[PDB]
């Protein structure tokens, strides 16, 4: 989820 600085 690229919407955050939190993905992968």
């Amino acid at each position: 989820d690229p919407a955050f600085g939190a993905n992968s």
Partner: single-chain antibody
Framework: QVQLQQSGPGLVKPSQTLSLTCGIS??????????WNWIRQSPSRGLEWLGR?????????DYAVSVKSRITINPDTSKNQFSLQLNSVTPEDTAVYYC??????????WGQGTTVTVSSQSVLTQPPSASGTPGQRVTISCSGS????????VYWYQQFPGTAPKLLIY???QRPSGVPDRFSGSKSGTSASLAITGLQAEDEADYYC???????????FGGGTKLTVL
Amino acid sequence: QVQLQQSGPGLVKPSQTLSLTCGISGDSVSSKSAAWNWIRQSPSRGLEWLGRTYYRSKWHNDYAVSVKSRITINPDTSKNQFSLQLNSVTPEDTAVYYCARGQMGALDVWGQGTTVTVSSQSVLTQPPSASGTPGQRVTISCSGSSSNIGSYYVYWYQQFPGTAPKLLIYGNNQRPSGVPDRFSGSKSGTSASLAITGLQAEDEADYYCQSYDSSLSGVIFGGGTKLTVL
């Protein structure tokens, strides 16, 4: 603490527009760490993510494939709220609608939900049902692909009937404070697992696996697993 208050009609005529409003308290709608989602749920469509809006130096909008051409999610910075607009509704759009906050890919805070009736790859793979006897360790699996689980975080939710899903596992294997350590998560390749040690009658609920798919450009949910304690 952060709470979300939902408002909207419980019935919309076909071909008409459904409008929902979600009020925020304890957080800003322009938060750099938050994203504001809409999710609906029905026996036919399952747990279906609808879309989201969020602020990263500008307002962004990510919509689901299924409702992209009919959906609009606008934030209101003054009233500190965000709305849902779905045009040309049909009986298929009959579901329970939730607004939820995403903070790290996890839907940690949910609204109580609004039942909306309309009258005159895409889904992660979970076992339809799981079961176990008290005291056992029970594990629920979820298989995906490189486009989703193989490349992104895995989240788990616990949902008791008539209530919004509760965050159980975030970031594959991390656990929010308050959640007992009986619940554990794991991820390897394109598969994930939710383990419940010391199974209790309390654990009888529906369990959902959640991730993100780059090919779908949106949040993807699993079919959900109904856990029965024998």
